[PDB]
Amino acid sequence: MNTVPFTSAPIEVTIGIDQYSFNVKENQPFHGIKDIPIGHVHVIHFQHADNSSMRYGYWFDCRMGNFYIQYDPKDGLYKMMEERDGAKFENIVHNFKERQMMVSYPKIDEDDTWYNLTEFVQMDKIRKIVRKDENQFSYVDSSMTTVQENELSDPAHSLNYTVINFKSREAIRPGHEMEDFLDKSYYLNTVMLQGIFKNSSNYFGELQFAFLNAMFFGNYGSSLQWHAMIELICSSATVPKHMLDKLDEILYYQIKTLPEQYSDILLNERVWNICLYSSFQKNSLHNTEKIMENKYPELL
Amino acid sequence: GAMNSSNYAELFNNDIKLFVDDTNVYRVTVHKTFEGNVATKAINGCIFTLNPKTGHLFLKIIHTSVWAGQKRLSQLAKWKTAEEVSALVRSLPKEEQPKQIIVTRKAMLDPLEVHMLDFPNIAIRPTELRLPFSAAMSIDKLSDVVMKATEPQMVLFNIYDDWLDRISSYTAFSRLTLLLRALKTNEESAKMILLSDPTITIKSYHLWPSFTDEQWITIESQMRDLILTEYGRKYNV
Numbered sequence: 001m002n003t004v005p006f007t008s009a010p011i012e013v014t015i016g017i018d019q020y021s022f023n024v025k026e027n028q029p030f031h032g033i034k035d036i037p038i039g040h041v042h043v044i045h046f047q048h049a050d051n052s053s054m055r056y057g058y059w060f061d062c063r064m065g066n067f068y069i070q071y072d073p074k075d076g077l078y079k080m081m082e083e084r085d086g087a088k089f090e091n092i093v094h095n096f097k098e099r100q101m102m103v104s105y106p107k108i109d110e111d112d113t114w115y116n117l118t119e120f121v122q123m124d125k126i127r128k129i130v131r132k133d134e135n136q137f138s139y140v141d142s143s144m145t146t147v148q149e150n151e152l153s154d155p156a157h158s159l160n161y162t163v164i165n166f167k168s169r170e171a172i173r174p175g176h177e178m179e180d181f182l183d184k185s186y187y188l189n190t191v192m193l194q195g196i197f198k199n200s201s202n203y204f205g206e207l208q209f210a211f212l213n214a215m216f217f218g219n220y221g222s223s224l225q226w227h228a229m230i231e232l233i234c235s236s237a238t239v240p241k242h243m244l245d246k247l248d249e250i251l252y253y254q255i256k257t258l259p260e261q262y263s264d265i266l267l268n269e270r271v272w273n274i275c276l277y278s279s280f281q282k283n284s285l286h287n288t289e290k291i292m293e294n295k296y297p298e299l300l
Numbered sequence: 301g302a303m304n305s306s307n308y309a310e311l312f313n314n315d316i317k318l319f320v321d322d323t324n325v326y327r328v329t330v331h332k333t334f335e336g337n338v339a340t341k342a343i344n345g346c347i348f349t350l351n352p353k354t355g356h357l358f359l360k361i362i363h364t365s366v367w368a369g370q371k372r373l374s375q376l377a378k379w380k381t382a383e384e385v386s387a388l389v390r391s392l393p394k395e396e397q398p399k400q401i402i403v404t405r406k407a408m409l410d411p412l413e414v415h416m417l418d419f420p421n422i423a424i425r426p427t428e429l430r431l432p433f434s435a436a437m438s439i440d441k442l443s444d445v446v447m448k449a450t451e452p453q454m455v456l457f458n459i460y461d462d463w464l465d466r467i468s469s470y471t472a473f474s475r476l477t478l479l480l481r482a483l484k485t486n487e488e489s490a491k492m493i494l495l496s497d498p499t500i501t502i503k504s505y506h507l508w509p510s511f512t513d514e515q516w517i518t519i520e521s522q523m524r525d526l527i528l529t530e531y532g533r534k535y536n537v
């Protein structure tokens with residue numbers, strides 16, 4: 001188990017760690033998060049009490065380094081940093097643990113939720129979507145735009161998701177206009193899976209990362225990307241059976257985890273009604289269809 | 301964006317544009333079968349592609365053989381229309397290619413957009429105008445070439461005959477849409493109006509009769525009366 005210590009907590013803030021969250025008061029003796037499960041990426045995220053503008057956060061993997069949080073009063077945010085001195089880092093954490101000034105990652109043992117939401121998400125792929133090569137961890141916030149959003153403006157602060165556009169030359173083979181527009185299998189299997197992502201695991205990783213950024217930061221371009229990646233699969237007549245079964249599992253846990261009161265802004269009615277009831281794969285998403293119908297029957 | 305009454309004069313400016321109407325592409329008769337089921341039989345159709353400034357009409361005849369062995373014909377017909385309109389645009393010299401293509405039915409937008417990806421600077425637009433181009437097959441010479449076709453054929457026509465020698469494009473389009481609306485509303489009566497007088501003839505090289513300026517005024521009034529008459533018959537007014 002690994003640890004992300006905090007130098008201090010000078011401003012009141014709601015802190016998230018994966019799907020968990022807790023409130024820290026202004027100048028409260030809080031010094032971080034312990035017992036973080038090794039083996040997964042994680043996200044530590046913030047929303048300031050005095051300014052809910054900019055949810056922001058950091059994706060990280062404790063296997064890649066020792067990371068801590070320190071508030072910057074000039075830039076006005078909690079920054080992640082890497083400590084390269086291992087002995088210094090261990091000694092700091094030990095003191096904070098001994099004084100019981102850290103919250104424990106509150107994982108229930110029966111509970112696979114975080115694994116189910118991040119099964120395909122790897123840090124190395126996050127660092128290609130979020131480009132800041134001098135850090136081993138990746139900053140995301142509520143306002144960052146995607147490369148596709150920018151094409152339709154600071155490129156260094158962008159989310160480089162894979163561009164999906166159903167009315168583009170990439171999606172449509174000359175001479176196969178109707179075929180490729182009504183059946184996106186070419187675009188899914190040849191252009192995207194064989195060509196760009198190389199395999200379905202990388203495709204699902206980006207889909208899962210997009211969802212998590214949409215959910216945790218309210219990042220609108222991330223929501224667009226998540227829905228586009230769902231729609232591309234569902235609008236394909238030819239999808240490997242293992243991929244459809246895995247998509248059903250991925251979407252089921254995403255819908256299960258979504259806050260009930262964010263469904264109006266995080267779920268696109270058109271995409272979901274099309275995917276569940278009209279698409280080639282309308283009968284391939286049994287678990288997702290059941291949870292959607294029982295939890296959000298209004299959207300449908 | 302969409303084309304409506306607010307930007308109606310844009311049709312007659314010097315930016316090349318084409319209307320595309322797909323109503324008459326897929327045409328069928330419906331009949332009972334020996335077993336008492338119902339079956340369709342396709343008949344030849346056409347794409348109606350019109351330059352409203354010049355009157356040039358690219359009427360692509362759609363021969364029934366293109367439907368043979370195909371499924372979902374009403375959907376296929378939109379894609380065939382887009383396929384045919386895009387090769388017409390590809391075939392046209394650069395300085396003749398349109399800057400805008402206006403489709404009369406919004407279901408043509410995506411098929412045409414996808415077929416025209418290679419032409420990102422040609423705007424594909426809907427219209428809020430209710431245009432009566434479905435009645436093109438009430439023009440005898442157009443109906444005749446479509447029904448006589450034995451293979452796909454592109455036929456060229458000026459739908460304004462020689463009117464632009466005497467009137468503006470705005471007026472010619474208004475006359476055309478009035479004639480087509482009248483033929484759409486009561487075809488028999490419209491043709492009666494257009495031919496009633498045997499001394500006015502259709503030139504071999506024209507579609508409509510050779511009316512004088514004064515006679516066109518009379519004809520246009522009679523067409524308006526027909527449309528109003530039929531509206532009264534319809535709604536009991």
Ligand SMILES: C[C@H](CC(=O)O)CC(=O)Nc1nccs1
Nearest residue numbers: 358360387388391392453454456
């Ligand atoms: C594809 C089409 C020919 C066909 O439909 O077989 C193209 C065409 O008719 N080009 C023209 N350029 C000037 C006047 S008509």
